[PDB]
Amino acid sequence: DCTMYICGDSTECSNLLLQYGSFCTQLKRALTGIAVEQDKNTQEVFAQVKQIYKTPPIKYFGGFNFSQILPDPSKPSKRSFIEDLLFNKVTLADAGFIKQYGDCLGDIAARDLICAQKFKGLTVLPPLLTDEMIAQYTSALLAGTIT
């Protein structure tokens, strides 16, 4: 929100900003152009298969043990043992999910940077493909090549 960033909570400052006008739109479009591209990138990398392949129930492959890179049913998200390792290593800022005012008011708002940035008109958006959907495509690619 270029207006809440530039002009904190003021209709009068919103009147002044209107003499500049098309700058704000040009920045919003430019950030929207980037936000659309993140999904295209993810689609071009992972969505290469138009079918979602599965491995058979009997995992044998000539002695080759893919069980550490294949999906595990016991996890709620279908990620592999190596995927669920990698997901601990990167400490993401705002993974798209809701803040519900039970949380970004009171305790967590006293020390959360994401809840701070939100109030200054700066917003992170979710990817179109969830990490469970990227696990599914990554499984489909893996199950395809091992069979």
Partner 1 sequence: FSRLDKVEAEVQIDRLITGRLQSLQTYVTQQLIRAAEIRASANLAATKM
Partner 2 sequence: ETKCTLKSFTVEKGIYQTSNFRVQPTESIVRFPNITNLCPFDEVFNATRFASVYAWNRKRISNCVADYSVLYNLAPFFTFKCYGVSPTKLNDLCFTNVYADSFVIRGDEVRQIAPGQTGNIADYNYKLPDDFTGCVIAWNSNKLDSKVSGNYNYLYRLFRKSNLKPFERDISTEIYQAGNKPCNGVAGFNCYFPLRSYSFRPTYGVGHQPYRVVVLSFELLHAPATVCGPKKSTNLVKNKCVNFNFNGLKGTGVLTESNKKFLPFQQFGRDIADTTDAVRDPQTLEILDITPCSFGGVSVITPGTNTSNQVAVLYQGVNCTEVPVAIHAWRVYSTGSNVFQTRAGCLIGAEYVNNSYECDIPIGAGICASYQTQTKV
Ligand X SMILES: *[C@@H]1O[C@H](CO)[C@@H](O[C@@H]2O[C@H](CO)[C@@H](O[C@H]3O[C@H](CO)[C@@H](O)[C@H](O)[C@@H]3O)[C@H](O)[C@H]2NC(C)=O)[C@H](O)[C@H]1NC(C)=O
Ligand Y SMILES: *[C@@H]1O[C@H](CO)[C@@H](O[C@@H]2O[C@H](CO)[C@@H](O)[C@H](O)[C@H]2NC(C)=O)[C@H](O)[C@H]1NC(C)=O
Residues contributing to the site for partner 1 (CB under 8 A): 2, 5-7, 12-13, 16-17, 20, 23, 26-27, 30-31, 34, 37-38, 41-42, 44-46, 48, 141
Q: Which residues contact 138 (CB under 8 A, 6 or more apart)?
A: 46, 83
Q: How far is the CB of 91 from partner 1 (least distance, A)?
A: 19
Beta-bridge partner residues of 71: 80
Residues 100-139 that bind ligand Y (CB under 6 A): 100, 102
Q: Where are the alpha helices (DSSP H) in the chain?
A: 2-6, 11-17, 22-46, 83-89, 113-119, 131-145
Task: Give the one entry of ligand Y, ligand X, partner 2, none that residue 67 binds, where binding means its C-beta sits below a cut-off of 5 to 8 angstroms depending on kind.
Answer: ligand X
Q: Are 37 and 44 in contact (CB under 8 A)?
A: no
Q: Output 2 or 114, the one with its CB closest to ligand Y.
A: 114
Q: Does 85 bind ligand X (CB under 6 A)?
A: no
Query: Residues interacting with ligand Y, by CB under 6 A?
Result: 98, 100, 102
